[PDB]
């Protein structure tokens, strides 16, 4: 048993009726002094280390050649000038086991935390020494954390893509289905999660060019995609993860849901394919009034109207579809479908729930397209256009497939540094750089949408950690007040930075002129409502920091009208799974699942108290399962009103909660404006 593992295990040994939280500092110190400093390759000078890394196929010479070695040396000086110390053993362990650069035999350590941060900053700045130093200060202060792909792979020769979330539209054709399988395998090969919209595919028992009842439906494509993701398993390193989305009004919705039942047949069940259900307001209205609903065969609708069923507004088109004799449908019970959804989420956590009209009532790019589905993590909500992949000899009609770049603000560190504006703008610049430098050669729609939309996702994390370390309960109205003010400021400065980038480059995103940013409809609630804190305690948290006012929002609206907006999408709160340990932060804006995290690595068990947990703030670190999910919905809806994309919203349920309770949580989330629901986690 390692000495640091023993020291970390002494946290649970209760001395004087309290956990020994101070043992984790001893644990991390022992971990470093006994393992990391021993296994860290040291070089006489930074020049020798850099030469070894570039020449041994560890780094990329292209981005490092943009600086004189003096500038790189000063950047590394800035990283090491902070004397950053990992507060807990788990932070250092997670970094040096997941993100630190190791030798080709994975025996020694080439990169410390400062080296990784310096390389990421030098890649972000793209030749600017002052910008690189600013990125170094931002990341070594741990105010901004680039996503796991960006943080892990930036500046590495043998790297995967810096983007890991992709959203593909699948057209109703064998050519398009085969192309979707190919692109899914190519993107999973790069290490990215792939989400596929299956709503355009015609249901089971539909006609294929005069041969009726010949289509296997969305479940055959589901099996194809599941095997494609199983094959493209990231070189046998990490299991290939993909998601499939289907509209709740699709005829195959029940077959779609039956793929996740525990009793599912092996010719129906899918293993590596997550499922998400898209629910328009029409379905919730039908279930509310207990009227019997209809699911429609998409190809009949396409033949009758020339438009896909998911391309049309179900609120206005549902009655026309039902009254159309040439549109084929079967009766369903919407309440029974809702209960089936809740039962499936209780049993397996699936499907994801995307409230279509909650997303699109505040969507800023409805002119480009409505948001029809989400990503594998249920936070990316962007307009997509389906591609028409024709025969081999013909020319394909390339659409827009969603792929956004992820980054997370550390709410605790941004708040303690009083640097919401600077951190938000620098994170926007880094995400923009990642977007520009991303070129995917086997997903033409993804590449086209990356070049045109220039969408980024700037998330946040350590919300519960910041609140509990400041004596604020997560469910308290003061917590929602802080979330309101903080994310209003984040949105303000992200919009300002996007407009500044548009002014600097003289270009906006494609089809910006039709957006609500161009017409000013986006800024209505910001030029009409004041989002300053309503509590003196919360207003004191923002001391020394200018909270944007209504006049500031009017000035921003005028600036955006004059100069445009560079990013179609800017903010999305991803789960931030493994980077939260490195940042000593609670995951995303979700509340903590456990106060102290018990995990086993190898044959030794490890203990991870939540960051900042102590005796004084023990009960402010309320576990998510002990919380009222209605108040968590209230918090996420408070945040969601300032996030243009969605938020990964996990439901934390007790074992005593019934199907009716899960349905009530889902319906209250729909009522409160929640766009997506990620997971149903039961204790």
């Amino acid at each position: 048993v390692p000495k640091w593992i023993q020291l970390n295990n002494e946290i649970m040994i209760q001395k004087d009726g309290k956990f020994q939280f101070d043992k984790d500092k001893e644990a991390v110190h022992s971990y470093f002094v006994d393992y990391i400093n021993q296994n860290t390759v040291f070089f006489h000078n930074l020049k020798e280390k850099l030469d070894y890394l570039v020449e041994n196929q560890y780094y990329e010479e292209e981005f490092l050649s943009l600086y004189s070695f003096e500038d790189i040396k000063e950047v590394f000086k800035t990283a090491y000038a902070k004397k950053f110390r990992f507060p807990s053993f788990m932070s250092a362990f997670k970094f040096y086991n997941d993100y630190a650069l190791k030798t080709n035999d994975k025996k020694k350590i080439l990169e410390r935390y400062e080296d990784r941060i310096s390389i990421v900053a030098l890649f972000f700045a793209n030749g600017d020494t002052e910008k690189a130093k600013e990125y170094v200060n931002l990341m070594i202060n741990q105010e901004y954390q680039p996503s796991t792909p960006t943080f892990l792979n930036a500046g590495r020769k043998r790297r995967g893509e810096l983007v890991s979330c992709f959203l593909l539209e699948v057209n109703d054709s064998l050519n398009d289905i085969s192309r979707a399988i190919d692109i899914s395998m190519q993107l999973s090969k790069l290490g990215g999660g792939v989400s596929l919209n299956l709503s355009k595919l015609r249901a089971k028992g539909e006609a294929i060019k005069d041969v009726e009842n010949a289509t296997k439906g969305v479940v055959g494509v589901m099996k194809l995609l599941d095997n494609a993701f199983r094959y493209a398993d990231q070189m046998g390193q990490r299991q290939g993860s993909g998601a499939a989305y289907l509209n709740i009004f699709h005829r195959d919705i029940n077959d779609f849901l039956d793929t996740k039942k525990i009793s599912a047949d092996e010719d129906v069940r899918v293993k590596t394919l997550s499922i998400g259900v898209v629910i328009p307001d029409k379905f919730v209205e039908l279930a509310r009034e207990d009227k019997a609903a209809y699911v429609f065969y998409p190809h009949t609708i396409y033949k009758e109207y020339g438009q896909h069923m998911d391309e049309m507004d179900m609120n206005e088109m549902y009655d026309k579809f039902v009254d159309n004799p040439r549109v084929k449908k079967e009766k369903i019970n919407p309440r029974k479908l809702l209960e089936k959804l809740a039962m499936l989420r209780s049993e397996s956590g699936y499907p994801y729930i995307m409230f279509q009209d909650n997303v699109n009532k505040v969507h800023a790019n409805n002119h480009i397209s409505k948001v029809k589905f989400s990503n594998l993590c249920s936070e990316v909500l962007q307009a997509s256009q389906v591609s028409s992949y024709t025969d081999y000899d013909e020319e394909d009609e390339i659409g827009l497939d969603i792929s956004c770049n992820l980054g997370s603000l550390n709410i605790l560190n941004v708040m303690e540094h009083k640097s919401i504006e600077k951190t938000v703008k620098l994170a926007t610049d880094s995400l923009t750089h990642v977007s520009e430098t991303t070129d995917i050669r086997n997903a033409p729609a993804v590449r086209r949408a990356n070049k045109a939309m220039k969408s980024i996702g700037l998330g946040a994390m350590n919300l519960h950690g910041y609140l509990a370390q400041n004596g604020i309960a997560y469910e308290s109205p003061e917590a929602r007040d802080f979330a309101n003010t903080f994310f209003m400021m984040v949105n303000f400065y992200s919009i300002q930075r996007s407009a500044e980038i548009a002014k600097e480059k003289g270009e906006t995103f494609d089809q910006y002129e039709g957006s609500t940013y161009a017409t000013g409809e986006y800024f209505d609630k910001y030029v009409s409502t004041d989002f300053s804190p309503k509590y003196e305690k919360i207003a004191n948290l923002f001391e020394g920091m200018h909270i944007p006012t209504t006049e500031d929002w009017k000035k921003l609206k005028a600036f955006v009208a004059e100069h445009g907006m560079y990013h179609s999408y800017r903010l999305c709160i991803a789960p931030t799974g493994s980077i939260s340990y490195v940042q000593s932060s609670t995951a995303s804006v979700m509340p903590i699942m456990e106060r102290i995290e018990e995990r086993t690595y190898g044959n030794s068990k490890t203990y991870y108290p939540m960051p900042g947990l102590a005796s004084n703030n023990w009960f402010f670190y309320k576990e998510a399962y002990d919380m009222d999910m209605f108040k968590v919905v209230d918090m996420i809806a408070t945040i969601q009103q300032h996030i243009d994309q969605g938020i990964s919203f996990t439901l934390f349920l007790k074992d005593t909660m019934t199907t009716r309770d899960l349905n009530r949580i889902d319906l209250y989330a729909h009522h409160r404006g929640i766009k997506t629901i990620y997971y149903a986690r039961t204790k």
Partner: protein, 289 residues
Amino acid sequence: DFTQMFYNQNVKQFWLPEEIALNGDLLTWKYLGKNEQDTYMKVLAGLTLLDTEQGNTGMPIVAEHVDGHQRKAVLNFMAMMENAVHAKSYSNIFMTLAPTETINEVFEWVKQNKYLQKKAQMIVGLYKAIQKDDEISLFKAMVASVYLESFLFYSGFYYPLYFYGQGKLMQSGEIINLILRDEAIHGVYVGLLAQEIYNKQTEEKKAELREFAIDLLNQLYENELEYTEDLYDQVGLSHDVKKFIRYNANKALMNLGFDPYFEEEDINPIVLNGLKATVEPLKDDDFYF
């Protein structure tokens, strides 16, 4: 939470010796060396002798002390498989490969063998020590049973699987694979019954039961190493058999809800080739807030 599921898996795995024709094994048996034939005979007798204890005592004694009608039924089914199916299958394999006099001599030898006897009597001793209404003594016997089902058989199973993976003695190897598949589920099931008892105990009592299980495993493991060298050195396989024992010891521990004891090792590829919370309806007013 588990007995009806195991009931289903057990009964759907039902099989009979007569289903596999054995005579075609003589076409590969005749080509083995004396040491190979000797090791095979000795291994087979070892498995036979241990499985008889499980049929006559191990399963019936556990069925007797476990409470619950459905558990008693599953346990009865497992005891039936030992006595009615497995025992007849081992006898059939023997009668096919050796003449009567050779069978009697091999069983005389294995009956006197120090390493086979040590493990057989250690297991039987724990079954004999179960006391009425004492769940601690029952747990100890369940641990012994899991160790037999999921661990002790495998120094023996190695050889038939080794031949089976090479295309030799395929009929008897198929039989052994069916037997092994039954013992695997027996070990998992009895393991769950042991964990149920373990979870009803205090923290101090749990630590004491863990020490018991590890101590017992150690005694059996050290004897398995000697048993292994005694049988497999003459055919040069002992190193690989030892890896297989440790791998199966880890499975046995996991069946008892314990951590693996031994580091992960790769196994001989030839042997590898051989091997609802509560539904409640929405009653309206849940759509209004």
